[PDB]
Amino acid sequence: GPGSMNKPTSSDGWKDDYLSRLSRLSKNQLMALALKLKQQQLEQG
Amino acid sequence: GPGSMNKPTSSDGWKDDYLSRLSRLSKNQLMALALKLKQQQLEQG
16 A cells, blocks of 8 residues: 555545545634635636 | 736735635535635646
8 A cells, every 4th residue: 555544646535634634623724724725726827 | 027026015905805704604615615725726836
């Protein structure tokens, strides 16, 4: 395997781990994260 | 024209309205929003 995780690399199974980790943030922290994500997708392209 | 600055100081106010609207979403919906932003910033740039 690729590491401690049993899942294959580069597959869309990262989305379940992203929802798993996102739920752990406080209300201010999830807002700071989503804002930091939003400004990146605006400055790209 | 020159690339600097990437934007003027004007119209930074979208960020405060983005925080204001992000706080209104349910636990599942704020994660769907952040995931929709994440897959875009991974495909872009």
